[PDB]
Amino acid sequence: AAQTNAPWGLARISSTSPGTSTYYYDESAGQGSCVYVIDTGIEASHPEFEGRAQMVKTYYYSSRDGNGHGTHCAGTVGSRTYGVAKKTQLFGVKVLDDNGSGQYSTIIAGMDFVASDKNNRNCPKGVVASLSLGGGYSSSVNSAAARLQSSGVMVAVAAGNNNADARNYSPASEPSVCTVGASDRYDRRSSFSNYGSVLDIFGPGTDILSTWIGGSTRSISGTSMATPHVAGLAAYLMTLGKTTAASACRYIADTANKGDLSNIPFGTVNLLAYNNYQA
């Protein structure tokens, strides 16, 4: 399948070169997989989700996304125009309030919620969780991310936006989950992207067009935007039967575009997520 005039990040993940604008992918498109977006919520009514999104949990007075961040991330995972895995099922878990903040205890509860809740959903091709959130190092937060992964969910987490070593952030620093740095459309490390040995992969994170609340769209930047590219990619590859929740991060690293990013610090992987789709 070919989507013309796609957002640059989608085109990038199906290309061996920067500078193209068409996204190529197998038409299976993550059908039969599920991605949990653990964030500020998802505006499921957005036409871009086509009825494939739903809120399953909130820790606040509403399950609505009053912020936008979660809706943008979910759009990059799975919206019809802005998404990597255009036929996945999207499940929203609102651990972040409408100001984008959340207590670590709530975030932990949301991770453990997903590990159990997947048993209430139909995801024959597999389950992914996208965590575009984080804070300072916490062993309890890392352990929750590790449990979620152990339970059979492909966990993708943002590296963080401090232009610093991600070893000092959680859940970024958890070794058993897939930690995602950000790049720009010229294959440069994004200016704000964290780095370090704990990173597993880079994805598009600068100037990413996706869904927003009020049935709208906008372009924003962050490792929050790179993470759902990787989560959507995992769902897509799992639907194709190429990998599993436990092995997908390694598979994505194995099949990445290698050595193509600039300003990668010595000791950080130079790997850019790539679907290796041959039309």
3-class secondary structure for the chain? CEECCCCHHHHHHCCCCCCCCCEECCCCCCCCEEEEEEECCCCCCCHHHCCCEEEEEECCCCCCCCCCHHHHHHHHHHCCCCCCCCCCEEEEEECCCCCCCCCHHHHHHHHHHHHHHHHHCCCCCEEEEEECCCEECCHHHHHHHHHHHHCCEEEEEECCCCCCEHHHEECCCCCCCEEEEEECCCCEECCCCCECCCCCEEEECCCEEEEECCCEEEEECCHHHHHHHHHHHHHHHHHCCCCCCCCHHHHHHHHCEECCCECCCCCCCCEECCCCCCC
Other beta carbons less than 10 A from residue 248's beta carbon? 24
Angle between helices 104-117 and 139-150 (to 10 degrees): 10
Question: Could you tell me which of 164, 169, 105 has the C-alpha nearest to residue 137?
Answer: 169
Q: Is 180 one of the annotated binding-site residues?
A: no
Contact 185, 12 (CB under 8 A): yes
Contact 210, 79 (CB under 8 A): yes
How far apart CA 248 and CA 238 sit, in angstroms, is: 8
How far apart CA 78 and CA 156 sit, in angstroms, is: 15
Query: What are the φ and ψ backbone dihedral angles of 94, each rounded to 5 degrees?
Result: -90, 90
Structure tokens at 111: 């991770």
Which residues are marked as active site? Answer: 39, 69, 224
How far apart CA 148 and CA 55 sit, in angstroms, is: 19
Write the CB contacts of 105 (distance below 8 Å, at least 6 apart in sequence).
none
51: alpha, beta or left, given left = phi > 0 and alpha = psi -120 to 50?
A: left
User: What is the β-pairing status of strands 126-131 and 153-158?
Assistant: parallel
How far apart CA 110 and CA 104 sit, in angstroms, is: 10
Contact 222, 73 (CB under 8 A): no
Q: How far is CA 4 from CA 29, 203, 258, in A?
A: 16, 20, 25
Longest dimension (CA), the chain: 46
Q: Is 187 one of the annotated binding-site residues?
A: no
How far apart CA 138 and CA 170 sit, in angstroms, is: 6
Q: Is 171 one of the annotated binding-site residues?
A: no
**For the chain, how many structural domains are there in total?**
1
Question: Which amino acid is located at 59 in the chain?
Answer: Y
Question: Could you tell me which of 157, 53, 180 has the C-alpha nearest to residue 110?
Answer: 157
Q: Is 207 one of the annotated binding-site residues?
A: no
Q: Is the dihedral of CA 29, 41, 145, 158 positive or negative?
A: positive
User: What is the β-pairing status of strands 53-58 and 23-24?
Assistant: unpaired
Structure tokens at 133: 């959130």
What is the length of the chain?
279
Nearest-5° angle of CA 67, CA 73, CA 77?
150
Q: Is 228 one of the annotated binding-site residues?
A: no
Resolution in angstrom units: 1.5
Write the CB contacts of 199 (distance below 8 Å, at least 6 apart in sequence).
159, 166, 179, 180, 181, 268, 269
Structure tokens at 101: 């903040």
Question: Which amino acid is located at 38 in the chain?
Answer: I
| CATH number for the domain that contains residue 221 | 3.40.50.200
Tell me how the structure was determined.
X-ray
Other beta carbons less than 10 A from residue 4's beta carbon? 8
Domain residues for the domain of 106 are 1-279
Asked if omega into 175 is within 30° of 0 (cis), the reply is no
Cα first-last separation, the chain? 7
Question: Could you tell me which of 252, 235, 250, 245 has the C-alpha nearest to residue 88?
Answer: 235
